[PDB]
């Protein structure tokens, strides 16, 4: 399946993607002893402005894995169709979860090459102090740079197609089509991250970004 064009997406879809990748929820050293719907983990009053936080997984084993662990969270947070747990406002999130104890000795800097229509642009940088880092966290961090510099989620920008590739030192590599949004709304867009896929930080080689114009 070839790279999806921006022109295919509803204004709402672009605004929702802009919103997700510009305002993620980022918190360190929190803990939940509460499973909901067998898959989700609940952090009471731990979200933005004291909201409740529902961290959603694809499987029950994933939730049981972090249940009652001191975790770090880094993911795309939404409200619409976030299921309430109490009468407090609830804020939702897929995956983005790793262990708080598992930190590097020194910050890992990962470089990203960037081309637009094959034209080499400035190299970009992201960081993490996590020994294990979610793929979600790094996708968010790249698309944030891309949003800032290239306006990838503005309807009227020249960027019309885009691809992000994570180049690993180990055999498996990962890829993201920036306009292959699984649907119009945050809860649909962000579901891609539910597997909680996590990379060893030392094994990441670098990132490649290819953006394309109408030309």
């Amino acid at each position, epitope marked *: 399946e070839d790279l999806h064009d921006k022109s295919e997406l509803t*204004d*709402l879809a*672009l*605004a*929702n993607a*802009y*919103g*997700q990748y*510009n*305002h993620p929820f980022i918190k360190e050293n929190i803990k939940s002893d509460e499973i909901s719907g067998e898959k989700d983990l609940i952090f009471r009053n731990q979200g933005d*402005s004291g909201n409740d936080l529902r961290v959603k997984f694809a499987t029950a084993d994933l939730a049981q894995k972090f249940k009652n662990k001191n975790v770090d969270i880094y993911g795309a*947070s*939404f*409200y*619409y*169709k*976030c299921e309430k747990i109490s009468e407090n*406002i609830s804020e939702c999130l897929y995956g983005g979860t790793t262990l708080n104890s598992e930190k590097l000795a020194q910050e890992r800097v990962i470089g990203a090459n960037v081309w637009v229509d094959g034209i080499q642009k400035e190299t970009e940088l992201i960081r993490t102090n996590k020994k294990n880092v979610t793929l979600q966290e790094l996708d968010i961090k790249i698309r944030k740079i891309l949003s800032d510099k290239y*306006k990838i*989620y*503005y309807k*009227d920008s020249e960027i019309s197609k885009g691809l992000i590739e994570f180049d690993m030192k180990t055999p498996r590599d990962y890829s993201f089509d920036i306009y292959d949004l699984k649907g119009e*709304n*945050d809860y649909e867009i962000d579901k891609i991250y539910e597997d909680n896929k996590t990379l060893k930080s030392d094994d990441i080689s670098h990132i490649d970004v290819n953006l394309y114009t109408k030309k």
Partner: T-cell receptor, first 109, second 113 residues
Framework: QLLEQSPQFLSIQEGENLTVYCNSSSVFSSLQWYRQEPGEGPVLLVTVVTGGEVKKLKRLTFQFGDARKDSSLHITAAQPGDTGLYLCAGAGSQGNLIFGKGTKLSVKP | DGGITQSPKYLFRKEGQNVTLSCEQNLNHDAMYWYRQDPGQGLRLIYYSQIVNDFQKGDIAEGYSVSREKKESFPLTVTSAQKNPTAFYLC???????????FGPGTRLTVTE
């Protein structure tokens, strides 16, 4: 990009709950509410940036429509000091704030 | 404890005269804005400026002009070509660390026949 605010004027007795509205046909990426005293500068109350976002600041409750097209401002147990002009403002992800015409709120003691 | 100011608070002129409205800020913001406010119209953007030496027309720039020579200061000039000069005029500034526009106290301009 056009924002419409509803109602234009509201007169209400202290102790009542009220809601005011900001509507558009366009999608907004961020939406804001300001309060203004006569012949002074508006002051920011809140900015909402995600559809379905509810923010609660004491007696005020702000909500962003799920589809990014509207916002409401709800006041619980209105008080005379809540009297003023309530201005909605919307950005869009790229280029600048457009303001509504304002709801003029008068709370009677 | 920085902020925005405007001066004078009250401005009165005969028709046919160009007039300067002053706006300073020491919040160290790059972006600055001028709005007019009319009864029942809310605020309408006249001119803005994203950084020193740069400025760009707003929704209703006809009749108005700005300069931005210094970061701190954003003079609005209401020209005799502006057909309905009488209004309440508001200046504002913002940073990219917040969505917030901070407003100056406003200046009231009345133009007499």
């Amino acid at each position: 990009q056009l924002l419409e605010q509803s109602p234009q004027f509201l007169s209400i007795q202290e102790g009542e709950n009220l809601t005011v509205y900001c509507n558009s046909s366009s999608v907004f990426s961020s939406l804001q509410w300001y309060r203004q005293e006569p012949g002074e500068g508006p002051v920011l109350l809140v900015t909402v940036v995600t559809g379905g976002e509810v923010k609660k600041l004491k007696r005020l409750t702000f909500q962003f429509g799920d589809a990014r097209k509207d916002s409401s401002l709800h006041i619980t147990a209105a008080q005379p000091g809540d009297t003023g002009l309530y201005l909605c403002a919307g950005a869009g992800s790229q280029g600048n704030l457009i303001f509504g015409k304002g709801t003029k709120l008068s709370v009677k003691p | 404890d920085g902020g925005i100011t405007q001066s004078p608070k009250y401005l009165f002129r005969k028709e046919g005269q160009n007039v300067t409205l002053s706006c300073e800020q020491n919040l160290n913001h790059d972006a600055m804005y001028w709005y007019r406010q009319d009864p029942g119209q809310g605020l309408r953007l006249i001119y803005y400026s994203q950084i020193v030496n740069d400025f760009q027309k707003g929704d209703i720039a006809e009749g108005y002009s700005v300069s931005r020579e210094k970061k701190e200061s954003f003079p609005l000039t209401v020209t005799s070509a502006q057909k309905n000069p009488t209004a309440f005029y508001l200046c504002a500034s913002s940073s990219r660390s917040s969505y917030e526009q901070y407003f100056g106290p406003g200046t009231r301009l009345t133009v007499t026949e």
